[PDB]
Amino acid sequence: SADSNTKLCSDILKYLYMDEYLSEGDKATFEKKCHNVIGNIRNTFSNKNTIKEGNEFLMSILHMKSLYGNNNNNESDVTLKSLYLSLKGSPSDDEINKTIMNFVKFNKYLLDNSNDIKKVHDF
């Protein structure tokens, strides 16, 4: 598990792609702390009542990619579905596909300063 703990913290930073924004010491402060957290998060993400903790954390990985991560494209074999199935390893493919599409539309929902102002609601 601790080996898999070292897998994810590399896999998260490979997904974040924040390489110009973090320091070399920041990655050192990163790998120590996410080694502590994820071992708890894998426990809570299993019991399906307590899934809101992992639902925010997997959202928080995606949201840091949009703001600080370089969205210049650079396949790379690491997506949300790499990260989600690693935690969910601790459902059919469609439901996994839907929850990530739920996560993608929520990140677009958070960044609608230009969108929502021009929008006029007429349902």
Distance CA 108, CA 89 (A): 27
Distance CA 93, CA 36 (A): 29
Per the entry, the structure determination technique was cryo-EM
Distance CA 20, CA 122 (A): 43
Residue from 52, 41, 44 nearest 8 by CA? 41
Give the DSSP letter of residue 21.
T
Distance CA 35, CA 43 (A): 14
Q: What is the resolution of this structure in A?
A: 3.7
Q: Which long-range contacts (CB under 8 A, 24 or more apart) does 101-109 make?
A: 103/58, 103/59, 103/62, 104/62, 104/80, 106/59, 107/59, 107/62, 107/63, 107/66
On the 0-12 / 13-18 / 19+ scale of CB atoms within 10 A, 83 is buried
